[PDB]
Amino acid sequence: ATSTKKLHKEPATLIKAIDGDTVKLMYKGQPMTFRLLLVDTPETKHPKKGVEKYGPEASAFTKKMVENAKKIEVEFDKGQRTDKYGRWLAYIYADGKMVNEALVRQGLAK
Numbered sequence: 506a507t508s509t510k511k512l513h514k515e516p517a518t519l520i521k522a523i524d525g526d527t528v529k530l531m532y533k534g535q536p537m538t539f540r541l542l543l544v545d546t547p548e549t550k551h552p553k554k555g556v557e558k559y560g561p562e563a564s565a566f567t568k569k570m571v572e573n574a575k576k577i578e579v580e581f582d583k584g585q586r587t588d589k590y591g592r593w594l595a596y597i598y599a600d601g602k603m604v605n606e607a608l609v610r611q612g613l614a615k
Contacts, residue, residue, distance in 0.1 A: 507609065508571070509535060509589075510582055510584055511582075511585055512580060512581065512582035512583070513582075514578050514580060515532065515533070515578065515579055516533070516535075516569055516577060516578045516579075517530040517531055517532040517533070517537070517539075517578075517595070518530070518531040518577050519531070519567060519568045519570075519571040519577060519597050519599070520536065520568060520571075521564070521567075521568040522563050522564040522568050522604075523538075523564065524556065524558070524560075524563070524564075525541075525555055525556035525563030525564065525567070525590070526540050526541045526544075526555045526563075527536075527539070527540050527591065528541075528567055528568070528597065529568075529591075530543060530579060530595065530597065533588075534572050536590025537590045537591060537593055538555075538590065538592065538593070539579065539581065539591070539592070539593040539595040539597070540591075540593065540594065540595065540603075541555060541595060541596065542594050542596075543555065543596070543605060545557065549566030549590040557609065557613060558613070558615075559608070559609070559613030559614075559615055560613075560615055561599070561603070562604065562607060562608060562609065562613050566604055566607055566608075567597065567604045568600030569604075570598070570600070570604050570607065571597065571599050572601075574599030574600035574603060576599065576600055576601070577596075577597060577598065577599050578598065579595035579596060579597050580595065580596040580598075581593055581594050581595035581596070582594065583585075
């Protein structure tokens with residue numbers, strides 16, 4: 506049923522986050538917005554609430570780590586069913602560590 510395609514690693518500099526999920530990404534000189542997949546909930550497992558209760562981790566931290574690190578690679582597939590050029594899947598991370606992997610590991614420092 507579910508076909509697992511080979512997702513390659515592509516470098517893209519995230520300029521700024523919008524609503525935590527939909528974020529802009531400078532893709533090989535040509536920026537594209539992206540809609541992450543990791544959808545979880547605050548204090549619960551991973552249901553519906555990609556934007557956990559932290560505050561900046563989304564709009565303030567997302568692009569922040571991208572401006573602090575010179576390595577922003579997105580684990581996005583090269584066959585993501587996008588609408589136009591802004592709803593691409595990905596796991597933007599700076600210096601190896603993903604924005605979500607930043608402080609969401611201990612409980613997003615507020």
